[PDB]
Design an enzyme around this catalytic site. Structure first.
Site, mmCIF file in Angstrom:
data_model
loop_
_atom_site.group_PDB
_atom_site.id
_atom_site.type_symbol
_atom_site.label_atom_id
_atom_site.label_comp_id
_atom_site.label_asym_id
_atom_site.label_seq_id
_atom_site.Cartn_x
_atom_site.Cartn_y
_atom_site.Cartn_z
ATOM 1 N N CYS A 61 42.263 40.639 45.106
ATOM 2 C CA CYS A 61 43.296 40.169 44.162
ATOM 3 C C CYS A 61 43.531 38.653 44.173
ATOM 4 C CB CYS A 61 44.638 40.869 44.434
ATOM 5 S SG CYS A 61 44.534 42.633 44.831
ATOM 6 N N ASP A 93 48.462 44.899 49.703
ATOM 7 C CA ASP A 93 48.979 46.266 49.808
ATOM 8 C C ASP A 93 47.873 47.299 49.982
ATOM 9 O OD1 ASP A 93 51.896 46.145 49.581
ATOM 10 O OD2 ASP A 93 51.471 45.168 47.664
ATOM 11 N N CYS A 134 48.373 39.254 42.725
ATOM 12 C CA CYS A 134 48.576 40.529 43.378
ATOM 13 C C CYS A 134 50.019 40.961 43.357
ATOM 14 C CB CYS A 134 48.111 40.342 44.831
ATOM 15 S SG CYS A 134 48.148 41.690 45.989
ATOM 16 N N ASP A 135 50.237 42.263 43.456
ATOM 17 C CA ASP A 135 51.530 42.971 43.475
ATOM 18 C C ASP A 135 52.818 42.128 43.588
ATOM 19 O OD1 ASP A 135 53.572 44.862 44.139
ATOM 20 O OD2 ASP A 135 52.066 46.237 44.890
ATOM 21 N N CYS A 206 44.551 45.344 41.447
ATOM 22 C CA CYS A 206 44.222 46.772 41.276
ATOM 23 C C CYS A 206 44.291 47.192 39.793
ATOM 24 C CB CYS A 206 45.137 47.639 42.146
ATOM 25 S SG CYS A 206 45.096 47.175 43.894
ATOM 26 N N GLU A 458 55.923 50.945 51.448
ATOM 27 C CA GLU A 458 55.384 51.895 50.495
ATOM 28 C C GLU A 458 54.468 52.870 51.250
ATOM 29 O OE1 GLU A 458 53.493 49.858 47.211
ATOM 30 O OE2 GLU A 458 52.661 51.762 46.480
ATOM 31 N N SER A 484 53.888 55.809 46.834
ATOM 32 C CA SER A 484 52.847 55.154 46.021
ATOM 33 C C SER A 484 52.422 55.952 44.800
ATOM 34 C CB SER A 484 51.596 54.898 46.862
ATOM 35 O OG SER A 484 51.848 53.959 47.883
#
Ligand code: FES
Ligand SMILES: [Mg+2]
Length: 569
Positions: A61, A93, A134-135, A206, A458, A484
């Protein structure tokens, strides 16, 4: 609220902040350093753009973001401005999932916000271009922009492409699932290892509609990214072109003095939420959008999410729920085509100003509509679900709220005896040893909240263990942390107050009859309010799992999941 965090500028000036150190004779030290880094006398007159990437080599990522950052810098220089790159941390993650390293994940958002705020303030930069990939990175960068209120643009690093090998498609979820398929006997060890070698073929976030693409899409809908930013893939040459144009756009934002608190408003926050519901976006967006809202001195509650969920149907056939991935949205007109459709349906507010220097409606006038014949975005009259996936639940066991993803395929009720675990590990040991004891139960994994986890990890392994044992629709899943994936059943996270704080979730005993009601929006207990109160008087908070470092600071600072886990209030 009136936000007081960062320095004010000392009004048509383009160098409102950097003039503090470039103009006065009494800042000769500052000017000496700036000559040292390569700025001429003429360069000192220009605006200075802090270019904040989240590059690092150990995650797909983030590994491409230094290259993107160089392209952003070149475009800032081509726009007549000085571009100063800096770079903050991030975590993966996907790497840390299933491990105690996940305790450090959510808080990296807030650490990222602090990092960018710090550099922008100390260095007196006039504007920001952020390049998260990323996230957690995405909301961290926006939170920093909101605190500073200096002109800013978020350039999404872009989604990863799905892996292809021998006419089969793979993504990160294939790699996660591969273990469970191997243990059950569905695949061989060689097929398992083949999935691992071909799941992540290059750079980018992702691939499906998980938190990264949810937040990227949401942030574009909020007007804080340029059109197409959320939908252009990481390795696409157009991503580099977007990077090279950010400077031109930011120059215009400086001339207009169009700031994050001019762009991020109740209506544009709603637009972001509309996009989450329409696209089937992650429950994590609740935490992140609350945090973004607070960063600009606005309010956003769980109830606001329920109202937007009720108002907006789920239309996108995208993973994890559906078939397609973010790359397929790109092929049929990208995020702007999706938002154009939602605007035409009357679901969004078109007059919200954006980082283009124009309104959302103006941006979406001049974009191609969804490609004729496309089957990804359903029409209004035939939605995948009539309302949004995101449901807020209260009741006896979550009096301050909780969040679940509800497809409509699971029914309106679940009732069963509680099976209670003090962390993820003990749950996984019990289901491994005695899987049939889980049938018909409401599984409670507690002590995994912001303070209890710590870090509100998570958790993926619980849902896949339930799926692997054949119990998907035959048990419910409750936590003060986060889950998740979907179990084809009732899965609830963000339960408040968390068990560490002595919320009712901490007082549940094995055998308590728990009833989940989606129509009523309640997670109730058959145990009397008096017996729950008697348990509360006996209860004492367990000791914190850490006494030092970043996670102990998180424990001291973090608010509840219902308040977006903000750390600076
Ligand atoms: S680990 Fe980066 S978006 Fe999934
Ligand atoms: Mg995540």
């Amino acid at each position: 609220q009136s936000v007081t965090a960062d320095p004010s500028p000392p009004t048509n000036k383009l160098n409102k902040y950097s003039s503090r150190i470039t103009e006065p004779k009494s800042q000769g030290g500052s000017q000496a350093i700036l000559h040292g880094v390569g700025l001429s006398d003429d360069d000192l007159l220009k605006p200075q753009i802090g270019i904040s990437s989240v590059w690092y080599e150990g995650n797909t990522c983030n590994m491409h973001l230094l290259k993107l950052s160089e392209a952003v810098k070149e475009g800032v220089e081509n726009a007549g401005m000085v571009g100063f790159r800096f770079n903050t941390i991030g975590v993966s993650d996907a790497i840390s999932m299933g491990t105690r390293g996940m305790c450090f994940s959510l808080q990296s958002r807030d650490l990222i916000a602090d990092s960018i705020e710090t550099v922008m303030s100390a260095q007196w930069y006039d504007g920001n271009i952020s390049i998260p990939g990323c996230d957690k990175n995405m909301p961290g960068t926006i939170m920093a922009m909101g605190r500073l209120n200096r002109p800013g643009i978020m350039v999404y690093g872009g989604t990863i492409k799905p892996g292809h090998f021998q006419d089969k498609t793979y993504d990160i979820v294939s790699a996660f699932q591969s273990y469970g398929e191997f243990v059950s006997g569905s695949i061989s060890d060689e097929q398992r290892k083949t999935v691992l070698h071909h799941s992540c073929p290059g750079a980018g976030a992702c691939g499906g509609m998980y938190t990264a693409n949810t937040m990227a899409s949401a942030i574009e809908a909020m007007g804080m990214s340029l059109p197409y930013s959320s939908s252009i893939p990481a390795e696409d040459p157009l991503k580099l072109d977007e990077c090279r144009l950010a400077g031109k756009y930011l120059l215009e934002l400086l001339k207009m003095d169009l700031k994050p608190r001019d762009i991020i408003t109740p209506k544009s926050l709603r637009n972001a939420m509309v996009s989450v519901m329409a696209l089937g976006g992650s429950t994590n967006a609740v935490l992140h959008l609350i945090a973004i809202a607070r960063s600009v001195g606005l309010e956003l509650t769980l109830d606001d999410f329920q109202k937007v969920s009720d108002a907006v149907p789920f239309l996108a056939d995208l993973k994890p729920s559906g078939k397609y991935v973010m790359e397929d949205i790109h092929k049929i007109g990208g995020t702007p085509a999706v938002l154009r459709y939602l605007l035409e349906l009357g679901l969004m507010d078109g007059d919200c100003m954006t980082v283009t220097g124009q309104t959302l409606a103006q941006n979406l006038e001049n974009v191609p509509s969804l490609t004729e014949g496309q089957e990804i975005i359903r029409p209004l009259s035939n939605p995948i679900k009539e309302t949004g996936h995101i449901q807020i639940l209260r009741g006896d066991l979550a009096p301050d709220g909780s969040v679940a993803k509800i497809t409509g395929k699971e029914g309106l009720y679940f009732s069963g005896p509680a099976l209670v675990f003090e962390g993820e590990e003990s749950m996984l040991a019990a289901i491994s040893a005695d899987p049939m004891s889980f049938k018909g139960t409401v599984v409670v994994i507690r002590g995994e909240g912001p303070k209890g986890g710590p870090g509100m990890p998570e958790m993926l392994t619980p849902t896949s263990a339930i799926m692997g044992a054949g119990l998907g629709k035959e048990c419910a899943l409750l936590t003060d942390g986060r889950f998740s994936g979907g179990s084809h059943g009732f899965v609830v996270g963000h339960i408040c107050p968390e068990a560490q704080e002595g919320g009712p979730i901490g007082l549940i005993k094995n055998g308590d009859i728990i009833t989940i009601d989606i129509g009523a929006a309640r997670i109730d207990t058959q145990v009397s309010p008096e017996e729950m109160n008697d348990r509360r008087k006996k209860w004492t908070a367990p000791a914190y799992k850490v006494n030092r470092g970043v996670l102990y600071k998180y424990i001291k600072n973090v608010q509840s999941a219902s308040d977006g886990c903000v750390t600076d209030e």
